[PDB]
Amino acid sequence: RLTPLLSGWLDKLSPQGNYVFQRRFVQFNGRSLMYFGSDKDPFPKGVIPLTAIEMTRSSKDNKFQVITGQRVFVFRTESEAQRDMWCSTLQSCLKEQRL
């Protein structure tokens, strides 16, 4: 039962703002990816359950993409190694779910 904990401030692409990056507090506990407007907020602005994620992949310029059946969620980190850590953690959880 993979239960990592990653949390930190990431930039998240907002399509509702005509595709501009907005600061979010993000947390992945192995069951779901939650993003909050602030780490002080009780409730997240959005939640992606692991069961909804079909793929997570890296992209240019320190981005990773969480891809579901109908949607993509694009996050940007401060460094490449940080992006790798989020992407490979998500990939590992998805590999466990898949197997």
Author numbering: 3 to 101
Study authors write:
Arap3, a dual GTPase-activating protein (GAP) for the small GTPases Arf6 and RhoA, plays key roles in regulating a wide range of biological processes, including cancer cell invasion and metastasis. Arap3 structurally consists of an N-terminal sterile alpha motif (SAM) domain, two catalytic GAP domains, ArfGAP and RhoGAP, a Ras-associating (RA) domain and five pleckstrin homology (PH) domains.
To understand how Arap3-PH1 domain recognizes PI(3,4,5)P3, we determined the crystal structures of unliganded and diC4-PI(3,4,5)P3-bound Arap3-PH1 domain, which refined to 2.1 and 3.3Å resolution, respectively. However, a significant structural change upon diC4-PI(3,4,5)P3 binding is observed in the region of β1/β2 loop (S298-V304), which exhibits an outward movement, with a Ca RMSD of 1.52 Å.
